[PDB]
Symmetry: D2
Subunit: 346 residues, 4 copies
Amino acid sequence: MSIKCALDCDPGHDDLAMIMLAVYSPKLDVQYISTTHGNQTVNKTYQNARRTLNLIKRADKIPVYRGYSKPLTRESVACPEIHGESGLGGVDWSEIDRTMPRNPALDILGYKDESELRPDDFFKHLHRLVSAAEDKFDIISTGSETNIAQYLLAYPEDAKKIRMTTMAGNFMIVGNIMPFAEFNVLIDPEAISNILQSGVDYTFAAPLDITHTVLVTEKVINDIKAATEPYSPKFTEMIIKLLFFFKDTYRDVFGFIDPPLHDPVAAFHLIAPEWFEHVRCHVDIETKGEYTYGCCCTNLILKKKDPTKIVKPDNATVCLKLKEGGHDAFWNQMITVWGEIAKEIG
Amino acid sequence: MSIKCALDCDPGHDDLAMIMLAVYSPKLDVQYISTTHGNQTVNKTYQNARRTLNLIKRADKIPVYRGYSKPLTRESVACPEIHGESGLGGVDWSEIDRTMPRNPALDILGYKDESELRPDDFFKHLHRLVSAAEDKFDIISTGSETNIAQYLLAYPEDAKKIRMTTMAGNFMIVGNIMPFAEFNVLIDPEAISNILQSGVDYTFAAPLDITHTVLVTEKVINDIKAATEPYSPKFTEMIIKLLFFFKDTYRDVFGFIDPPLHDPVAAFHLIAPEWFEHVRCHVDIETKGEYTYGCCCTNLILKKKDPTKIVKPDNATVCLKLKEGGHDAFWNQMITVWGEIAKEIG
Amino acid sequence: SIKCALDCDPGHDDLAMIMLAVYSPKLDVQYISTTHGNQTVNKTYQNARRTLNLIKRADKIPVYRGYSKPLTRESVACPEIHGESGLGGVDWSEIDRTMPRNPALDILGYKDESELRPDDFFKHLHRLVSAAEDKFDIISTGSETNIAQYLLAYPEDAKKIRMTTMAGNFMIVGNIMPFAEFNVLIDPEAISNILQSGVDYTFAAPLDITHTVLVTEKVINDIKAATEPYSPKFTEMIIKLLFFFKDTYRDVFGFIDPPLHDPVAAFHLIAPEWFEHVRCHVDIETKGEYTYGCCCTNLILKKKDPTKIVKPDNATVCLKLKEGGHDAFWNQMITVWGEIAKEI
Amino acid sequence: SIKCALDCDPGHDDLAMIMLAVYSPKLDVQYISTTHGNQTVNKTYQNARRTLNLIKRADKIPVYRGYSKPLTRESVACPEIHGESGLGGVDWSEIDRTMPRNPALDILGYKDESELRPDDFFKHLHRLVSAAEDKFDIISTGSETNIAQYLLAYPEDAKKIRMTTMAGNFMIVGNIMPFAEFNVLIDPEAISNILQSGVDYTFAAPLDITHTVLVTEKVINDIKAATEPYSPKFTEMIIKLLFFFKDTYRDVFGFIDPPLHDPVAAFHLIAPEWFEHVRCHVDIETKGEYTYGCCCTNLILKKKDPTKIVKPDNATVCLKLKEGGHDAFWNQMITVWGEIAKEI
Ligand SMILES: [Ca+2]
Ligand SMILES: [Ca+2]
Ligand SMILES: [Ca+2]
Ligand SMILES: [Ca+2]
Ligand SMILES: [Mg+2]
Ligand SMILES: [Mg+2]
Ligand SMILES: [Mg+2]
Ligand SMILES: [Mg+2]
Ligand code: NI
Ligand code: NI
């Protein structure tokens, strides 16, 4: 039936939607959430994960770990909040923050308070899960992959028993935050480079190639409303506000009429991979490039050019598109979860 | 009326079409052609330029220089012909080769034979043209830019009086020969880096962004036939064979139903720039990247994000698309030239 | 008495450094962490425990087994199927058989050494850093991967750590590569990270110094005079360890008498008055293809034009021992070897 | 008598090298090409002509003005508005006024020096390379941009060129940067290109040698004995040129007596028997951020394990002068200065 997994993320509006999908999906049995640094600090992403869980009535059920604050060998790009903005904008979190229950991780760790949380806390829990897995243990990663790189440096022999499903990278289209690279890779390219060389079974399930086709149209919004408004009009509003928080930026900067939704597509891959195309290849992560670090460079074209002249072994699976009906299936899954959450919030 | 210019290229089927357009266009007054290394040796590209000129009855009129054999600081990617293939495939050049007239460059240089041709031969001629130009002298470049980099190393003070119009690079779409870079840049990225820092007025007139939309459809072929068949059915056949020589590769490797035509678009920019969109930006050429050398990385997105936070000065113009009617205008120009050539061949 | 931790990859030199630090009454060793080197971190772990048991301290000092490879580069460790111990020239069979339980296991609540994990030392170091009045002292004489890993997990502790290292070369060339020293080039990103972190960092024992700390026949005779009357067996093994690479140093590097490296770093913590010190900005080469691990400083620019300095100082460098420093070092080492001889 | 060309950036050292090569009967200098350095290539052009006119040879030897900057990097030349000549310590006013026409102009069919272009020397070098029975000899004592540019234009000539250079440092550290020497680091891509091209390349005068070629009080007295009886004015200027950087070498680099570099390369072409030679593979660092221009060899790997060598030899390196080599060098230099004194 259900698949045990861990979520590693940097919420983040997209990651919030991914957490909702993974936690409320009966197909996924979330063991824990670990947070990482991003354009916000790891302490902020920690809080944002807990906010997400408390909004959906699960903050007392799922342990959240606060991971590493910066990349392996590069500087963080995290910005301070300027003057007491929430850091997960579009919503007032004041109530969610004050009603926040105790993090279950504290009891697992034998800690009294959150000030004792350390980046490597999740390690022993992941090792237990990896050890107990019959084949491989599933991690969904939708932020920087520093946490997993750090884990593999401490537990190198676990690489062969880990399967990663990620939102990361761009292959046949260009990048977002930099010309040819995607945020999650370029923020710590050494980490993903390390992971690909470690023996991890790695799938780029949700590169920009796919997520730029997963768009929040007026049609989607109406489907959200039909599923959520009868149970929780308040939740309806928050979801829409979160989904549309960057609508203007995506339009004005990137030419999107309707904004994309990224990270939940990775969880959807673990739920229902049959909706995705897959190809195997060797991915090199650019680390030396001055302007191109985090580029995901593949030998896919060389395979089509001259199959026999391939030298480098395949080290990854890449999903370049959803199959017909895949977009509909994704939105159906997401709307189902939002509806269930709406029923629980009331 | 007409604009004096020089062509620097690596023919190449695309470059052949560019030479035809520039030479037969009354708007462009071609002073010389210099050839460069590419996926064929500079001696082969030299021959291919002369073949082009002799096919169109101009080999006695235009001096051709044989330029540099390899990049500034990298290895050539030139391949040998395997067993006496022409090197400009789709056509038997045996007659064109044997009827080849003397290269006018030899008399300019005071040389007796082609074995005396040296890479720096074109320098003095270009310097005369640059010196005599009222404003700037126009160069059309559709291969590696090694020759122009070499020129500027010898004549640094001429940079400010040169305007380059190129087929090179990719900006908002991915690369061809490598994941994120285009052949002409990645073959000698140091050369283009040098040029952009030199003071040259540089326009990326025909990046893949445009040329991947300039497609040889059945409609185009029929228009070619209507213009050429009444005067020279033999020429009609050769043009089509040259245009379609890589049709299968473009289809099977790159998914093109109809194949692109690249290099002549750069000459069309010099003829009629009003059909092109233009934007100014700072282009960094990746030289350190292991897998991403030759990437054209711009601050275009940073301009749209935060105009006031721009630091690096603009160093290039980029043409990201043709305006409405631009494709039609391009094909009309090309077909007009092919028709005139057809009349001359008979 | 100064509380400290040792991080090392024994290693013949590191063995001598452990002996000095542990037997010196000036240093109170809280733990030893081991790192990857020419051999695996599991071998260096064993070699540290061998050292402690030889000197009758293996029941007193916890040993942690640290990280197996660099942050972002491959290990240079031989594969175990080469069968190289990393403490050659001596039969360890008795030392291995008589080995007592590692005190680390009880601290960690582990039953056996198979449970040791790279990050085990973290909580112990954090306790020591927290309790330090000023800064806590670490002696590092191998790759610095362990400390980089620690600082990635505890970035706010950087400002309360002082590192004293054997690493680098400044005014002379390198050993394993033309212009760089083994401990840096094995993980240059780690040292780069440490220098940027806020750690108070001293290059106490670069090759500049250690290549002048030579095991002469005079030194050997002084060792014998101190050790032979109490333990002739120990005398033999110390000399065999000191001279294990004598031929290579001679034939490859032109040394008539071989150097002794790592203990010089511990000697700096014991008696810094014997060392020259200069502050500067050290850049660690990480991009270079053939020069990664090079320690590049602005020392010449300081002497050229003091006011035109741009980069802030991030390190202290010891370029030479002062007059009498060599004598003082050997006196210290011989004293410790003598005390071990009396015990062991 | 060996036909050769000089490529240089005078420069006080290069001035001495020109004097040696031109006045030595063993070397038949065909031309001098100048390159960019600490000053512009136009200044080094002038400085070469100054040198020739001082020694009464400016009407005999053509001088070419080469490339103004490195292949792919920025020049490190001061801007001309600093007003630094690059041959400081001497008034050149008379030498400038009496300067005869450059013979290069007639070879090139130019009317004046304003027509000189960087690639002017190419056709002359190609004639000499073509006519050489074996290989044609180039002495290079500045950036090697000119020769790299030549080989890009004439790749098939590489196999008929022999280069003898002052460049690099191998078993000691660098000068202008921690681990690299000026002539390499100013254009490392150029030397990288040359080593890959098929040129027969000798590092005849790395810092390893030139830092042992010192202008002692003994040398100065020998200079005086040879020159003062014929031209006391020349004596003064030679000494002033030799000692122009004496204070900097002392205060920055610890030299009691300053080195003399570039003429050692010409001395190698005259009398190679005074030099040790070893063949190896030299990699020039181009990627390094702080270490570009480092000359990294496989010399240690050869001594470690001769059979495990992978990369083919691409260079000869001279790491030291043989016994009597220093004496022979100074004897040669003093002889030339004496002959100049008699003429000038
Ligand atoms: Ca995310
Ligand atoms: Ca072309
Ligand atoms: Ca060690
Ligand atoms: Ca010089
Ligand atoms: Mg679930
Ligand atoms: Mg025309
Ligand atoms: Mg002690
Ligand atoms: Mg001579
Ligand atoms: Ni081995
Ligand atoms: Ni100046």
